[PDB]
Design a binder for these strands. Structure first.
Lengths: 310, 198, 50, 50
RNA sequence: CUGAUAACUUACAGGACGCUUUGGCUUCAUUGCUUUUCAGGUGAACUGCCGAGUAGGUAG
């Protein structure tokens, strides 16, 4: 196994989370931040991004694109593991469909998990996402603190049975596509602390920013907004929290990595047990202990995949 | 014609900004019992990081200087050996002269500060005539400040935990008698009086 | 290949984030669309060898 | 006086010349080479053996 | 306990006169670099007053 050239291409293509301040006059201005550089007597740049006084509310806008680039590998090298992975995908699609991963991927798009810390000390935030292709109105959400909390709250009539399909028909259908235009309205209090994404600084708090209308505005990352909607993994030995769907299941804030090859639950002990997982998905019945939990992770990692070389 | 009693922080592991603040808070606890504003600040070995190891209290008549260093804080902190007091030596006739003025124009640059400024400008826009649009008020863009070595004080009759920040700029050895505030100081609104940096 | 290594790949040493420096290009906010222009030329240089 | 990304001259010659589906079996057009080389599936079809 | 023991090579000096290297010249065919990415301000430096103030000062 691992045939010295096995790369995939990502299915979920998120974009930059552009901030805008809306006024009582109902006009949108780019959010601006200052930079306090210290000038010690005879560079240490520290940024602050607060909501300006008299502002009505904040609007965060980004566009996410679900694609069908998990069926065929990008560069396979050998045509023995190629039909293995393709067979394993279509067998997974046939036996236990994409509904679960689709729900898990759309739940943390439709509750503002991609804001990270802007939900903290927030009165209400309303998400309006425009899907494509669509034939109707904007799929708008109410205050997401009381209303939409559990899985059952999201499963209402006119806003779940129509946008999980088009993601299910994206991952299934060849060159299948679903482009969601997500706009979230944050009702923050007077001079509330907005927390965007910061630059690396290879060697204190310099913000990541881009130019809108000739002035710089904070961005909240491009990869900090894909690593939020892909916080799914809770299928690791016991269970604590949703992790980032990595190879070795690396936790960020806590420095250790659960799902580590000593345990044998990482994406190399499971990828090399492919020939077993085609045999298990043949007939009845697949258990939800060490099969479906592993197949979920396998596919959750094939969506992010690239590049598996050794 | 000045006297000075230096107190120096001994025990190897201490935050001098955290302790100098308390010394100034004891000096603020002082002189709202007796109506005087005579006692100094005087940081001798002021560096460009961590305002240094000792602090002196320069003043005139000296009958109110000695009383400040027996306030049952300094005595209690001298008993268990953390401080070390010098016994009232006259200033030498050749000295470097510095002004430790509290700027108070750095807490008016911070976002919560300039919002408070704008919110005060809103309240006194009732000098009638249709008022400013608050959208035309930007956090400048690229501010730079030096150097201000901020100390951590707090109010008593409220629960504000302000902080005062002080800079070292030096000038013109003598004018004043003496005036210069309840947080010692070289700022207070009229007297920019040199303190002679024992 | 293809065992498990010595304790240099420990759990604390596989949570150490490695930096990349990559060129990112995106459509700026408030753009109408992208316009791509090139010129191709078909000629008769396959009749006679060079 | 602004640097801009280009997509290349030789890449867009290898785009307008992906027409070769006349190769032993047939699936999709390849880049017209001599030894019918495929990029993704790293093995080349149209090898000097066949 | 040395092929042992001992040891002054030194004076003076003009290389100069003259010199054309030049004629000619086609480097040119073909070209896919691509796959994947969290940098992390625990709450925290506030609230006033004077001032026509994005100036400048002030108390706690």
């Amino acid at each position: 196994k691992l045939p010295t050239n096995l790369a995939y291409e990502r299915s979920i293509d998120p974009s930059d989370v552009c901030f805008f301040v809306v006024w009582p006059d109902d006009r949108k201005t780019p959010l601006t931040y200052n930079s306090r550089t210290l000038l010690g007597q005879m560079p240490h740049q520290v940024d602050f991004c607060h909501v300006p006084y008299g502002a009505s509310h904040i609007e965060c806008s980004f566009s996410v694109s679900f694609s069908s680039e998990l069926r065929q590998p990008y560069k396979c090298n050998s045509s023995k593991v190629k039909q293995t992975l393709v067979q394993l995908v279509e067998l997974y699609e046939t036996k236990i469909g994409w509904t679960e991963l689709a729900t898990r991927y759309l739940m943390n798009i439709c509750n503002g998990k991609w804001l990270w810390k802007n939900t903290r000390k927030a009165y209400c935030w309303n998400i309006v996402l425009t899907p494509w292709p669509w034939n109707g109105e904007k799929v708008g959400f109410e205050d997401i603190r009381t209303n939409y909390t559990s899985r059952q709250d999201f499963k209402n009539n006119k806003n779940w049975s129509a946008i999980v399909e088009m993601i299910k028909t994206a991952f299934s259908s060849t060159d299948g596509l679903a482009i969601f235009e997500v706009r979230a309205t944050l009702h923050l209090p007077t001079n509330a602390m907005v927390r965007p994404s910061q630059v690396f600084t290879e060697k204190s708090r310099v913000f990541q920013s881009t130019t809108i209308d000739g002035e710089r505005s904070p961005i909240l990352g491009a990869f900090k907004t894909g690593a939020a909607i892909a916080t799914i993994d809770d299928w690791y030995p016991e269970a604590t929290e949703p992790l980032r769907v990595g190879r070795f299941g690396v936790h960020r804030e806590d420095v250790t990595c659960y799902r580590h090859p000593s345990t044998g639950k990482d994406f190399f002990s499971i990828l090399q047990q492919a020939e077993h997982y085609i045999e298990v998905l043949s007939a009845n019945k697949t258990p939800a202990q060490e099969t479906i939990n592993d197949m979920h992770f396998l596919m959750a990692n094939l969506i992010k995949g690239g590049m598996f070389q050794h | 014609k000045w006297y000075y009693k230096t107190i120096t922080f001994l025990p190897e592991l201490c935050n001098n900004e955290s302790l100098a603040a308390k010394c100034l808070r004891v000096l603020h606890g002082f002189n709202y019992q007796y109506e005087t504003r005579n006692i100094g600040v005087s940081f001798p070995l002021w560096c460009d990081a961590t305002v240094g190891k000792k602090i002196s209290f320069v003043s005139k008549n000296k009958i109110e200087l000695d009383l400040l260093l027996k306030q049952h804080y300094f005595v209690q902190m001298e008993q268990l050996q953390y401080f070390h007091i010098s016994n009232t030596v006259l200033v030498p006739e050749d000295c470097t002269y510095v002004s430790f003025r509290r700027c108070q124009s750095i807490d008016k640059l911070t976002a919560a500060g300039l919002a408070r400024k704008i919110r005060r400008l809103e309240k006194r826009a009732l000098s009638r005539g249709e008022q400013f649009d608050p959208s035309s008020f930007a956090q400048k863009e690229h501010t730079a400040i030096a150097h201000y070595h901020s100390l951590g004080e707090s109010s008593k009759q409220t629960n504000r935990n302000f902080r005062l920040n002080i800079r070292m700029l030096s000038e013109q050895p003598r004018e004043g008698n003496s005036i210069f505030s309840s947080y010692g100081l070289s700022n207070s609104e009229n007297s920019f009086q040199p303190v002679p940096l024992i | 290949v293809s065992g498990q290594p010595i304790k240099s790949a420990t759990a604390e040493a596989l949570a150490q984030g490695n930096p990349h420096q990559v060129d990112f290009c995106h459509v700026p906010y408030g753009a109408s669309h992208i316009e791509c222009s090139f010129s191709v030329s078909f000629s008769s240089e396959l009749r006679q060898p060079y």
